[PDB]
């Protein structure tokens, strides 16, 4: 098992690497999926997340696309879209990932934090938002 403190971490790099590792047979647990960072213009990152949630298939049967409002779920959903869920290995893969909100563990396992894209640079990147801010705006609990 890996407990990753994903404070600082670009959601996509963590998810790609996590999606391959869970498929290998490993267990990842993400702690701090709300203090993690996403770069980009603020306006577009909010417009993408809102649009998804808003769906409303055409008026919404009580089926079709749901997208969640809370950031903790957003990371967890992001790694699942990178896995399948109608293939055996994938459907299982989704149960090997769990999100815990904040850190209520006393462990920190394996950490990737390398500066290559996967962790930010705070003095070389022109603009970013913390994800928690956007989740609040969407109307989540957190």
């Amino acid at each position: 098992m890996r407990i990753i403190n994903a404070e600082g971490l670009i959601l996509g790099r963590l998810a790609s690497k996590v999606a391959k590792m869970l498929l290998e047979g490993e267990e990842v647990v993400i702690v701090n999926a709300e203090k993690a960072v996403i770069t980009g213009n603020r306006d577009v990152i909010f417009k993408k997340y809102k649009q998804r949630t808003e769906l409303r298939t055409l008026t919404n049967p009580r089926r079709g696309p749901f997208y969640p409002k809370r950031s903790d779920e957003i990371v967890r959903r992001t790694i699942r879209g990178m896995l399948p869920w109608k293939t055996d290995r994938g459907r299982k893969a989704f149960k090997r990932l769990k999100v815990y909100v904040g850190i209520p563990k006393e462990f920190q396992g394996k950490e990737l934090e390398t500066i290559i894209e996967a962790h930010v640079s705070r003095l070389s990147r022109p603009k970013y938002v913390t994800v928690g801010e956007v989740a609040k705006f969407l109307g989540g609990k957190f």
């Binding site: 055409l58 008026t59 049967p61 009580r62 815990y100 909100v101 209520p104």
Partner: protein, 342 residues
């Protein structure tokens, strides 16, 4: 038509219409989270009657007569049978522990020890622990029950939750504690002249039509096959039916909140003590249609109340005050009525 904008018929602000998952009203606003006393007081709707009052709120100008219907409700005395502690988790609020405290107890369908004395003392000690720490606990709410025994509509206790506010967690704990060993009053929680919300599961019609649920306008000169049918439901693509379109199915047995009904009067009996203002304790002769004997603490509240006759209704303080009218502390009752519903 000619692209004629037509306002929607039915709503999505209240839809869906269906059966309530419990006959206990639902709450998602708490007006006594950080403020003492329960979220109002619960009774059974006796019926309605009407009363003539003097402005109060200006119909035109103050000092003019106004007609107002009022719903008279036999409330039972309520009594705290359980202390609930919460601990805040990280997926929402989760239940720390509880104290459970005991022929009505027999009529209730709820599980019973079988070693009453023992179980109760362990939960109670557990609670003192939780209370001390004291920040484990972030709020405390009360399991509270009705007591019908002079009231003939039903004689089982309907059991519900009301929060008990307080400034801080230790204070809510002391207050709740005193309360278990005691009865309660219409007088204690509530006072006349506030605006209060009313929560209830409305009367069940059973299954009703598109005519009744959504409203269906009538049609042309002559119609051979009906005017109460659905018409179009939709195009060729979309290839599927929506839910925004007229259908038949359940209307009623749904929880409804109606806001801001002014508290006119509090007394006890009825019709065994006669007052010339604040209502004469209006009790119809021949009794009420389809409702049991009245004799207990009562409240007669303004306007409409969700819930037809013979149904358990609950009251909640308001989540807003009036907004171009002033509140009046203690309504004024110019003259009275003693009419029959027969």
């Amino acid at each position: 038509m000619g692209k004629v904008h037509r306002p929607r018929r039915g709503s999505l602000g209240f839809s869906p219409r269906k059966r309530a998952k419990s006959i206990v009203p639902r709450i998602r606003s708490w007006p006594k989270e950080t403020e003492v006393r329960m979220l109002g007081f619960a009774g059974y709707k006796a019926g309605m009657t009407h009363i003539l009052m003097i402005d109060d709120e200006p119909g035109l100008t103050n000092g003019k007569e106004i007609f107002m219907p009022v719903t008279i409700i036999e409330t039972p005395p309520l009594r705290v049978f359980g202390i609930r502690a919460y601990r805040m988790g990280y997926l929402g609020l989760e239940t720390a522990t509880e104290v459970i405290v005991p022929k009505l107890l027999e009529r209730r369908i709820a599980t019973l020890p079988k070693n009453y004395t023992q179980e109760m003392f362990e939960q109670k000690l557990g609670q003192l622990e939780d209370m001390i720490k004291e920040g484990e606990i972030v709020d405390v709410r009360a399991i509270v029950a009705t007591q019908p025994w002079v009231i003939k509509l039903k004689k089982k206790p309907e059991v519900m939750e009301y929060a008990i506010g307080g400034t801080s967690v230790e204070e809510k704990f002391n207050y709740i504690k005193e309360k278990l060993g005691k009865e309660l009053r219409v007088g204690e929680v509530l006072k006349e002249g506030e605006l209060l919300d009313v929560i209830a599961v409305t009367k069940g019609k059973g299954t009703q039509g598109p005519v009744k649920r959504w409203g269906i306008k009538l049609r042309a000169h002559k119609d051979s096959k009906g005017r109460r049918k659905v018409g179009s439901i939709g195009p060729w693509h979309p290839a599927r039916v929506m839910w925004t379109v007229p259908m038949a199915g359940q209307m009623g047995f749904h929880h409804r909140t109606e806001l801001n009904k002014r508290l006119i009067a509090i007394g006890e009996n009825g019709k065994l003590k006669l007052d010339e203002n604040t209502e004469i304790e209006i009790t119809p002769k021949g009794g009420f249609p389809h409702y049991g004997i009245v004799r207990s603490d009562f409240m007669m509240i303004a306007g409409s109340v969700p819930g037809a006759i013979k149904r358990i209704i609950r009251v909640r303080p308001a989540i807003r005050p009036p907004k171009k009218k002033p509140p009046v502390q203690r309504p004024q009752i110019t003259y009275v009525s003693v009419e029959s519903k027969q």
